[PDB]
């Protein structure tokens, strides 16, 4: 798990193989804290929130598509951690809308 999270840090930054030590140290801290997620396990409940999110960015065709993909996903492998992956993706979603500001001058402040 030490290796996996360190490799996680190195990969995202696209470089730094022992220079991402500081970011790593933080990540070890956040993970070491605890959470109580609103909605805990149960596959139906997470699928329902994902569909609402799809409709909201106006990607209807995608909402219908995903549902087949969910049944398929299950069939390919069955976990007790299935829900944690689907909720993880959910939170980590990105909106298409707006520019995500500058980073080419926002760095400096």
């Amino acid at each position: 798990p030490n290796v996996l999270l360190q490799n996680l840090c190195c990969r995202i930054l696209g470089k730094g193989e022992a220079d991402v030590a500081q970011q790593f140290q933080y990540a070890v801290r956040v993970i070491g804290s605890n959470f109580a997620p609103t909605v805990e396990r149960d596959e139906f409940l997470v699928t329902e929130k994902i569909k609402k999110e799809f409709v909201r960015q106006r990607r209807e065709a995608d909402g219908a598509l995903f549902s087949e993909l969910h049944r398929k996903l299950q069939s390919q492998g069955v976990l007790k951690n299935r829900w944690s992956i689907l909720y993880l993706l959910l939170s980590l979603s990105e909106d298409p809308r707006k520019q995500p500001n500058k980073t080419s001058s926002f760095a400096a402040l």
Binding site: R11, I12, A27, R59, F66, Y87, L89, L90
Partner: protein, 59 residues
């Protein structure tokens, strides 16, 4: 190896549609950590700080 690869490929289909915006390699790590027990909320949070940190750095 056969079983594992086939969930990931189905998993990468969802990720590109839902607009995760993560890479393939990184996702496999996210999934291994879950199966070993991680909280989802913490895991997204870490991803987010790392992501923002990379963009600023490049420019």
């Amino acid at each position: 190896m056969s079983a594992v690869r086939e969930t990931m490929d189905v998993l990468l289909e969802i990720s590109r549609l839902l607009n995760t915006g993560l890479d393939m390699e990184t996702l496999s790590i996210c999934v291994r950590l879950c199966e070993q027990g991680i909280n989802p909320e913490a895991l997204s949070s870490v991803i987010k700080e790392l992501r923002r940190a990379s963009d600023t750095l490049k420019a």
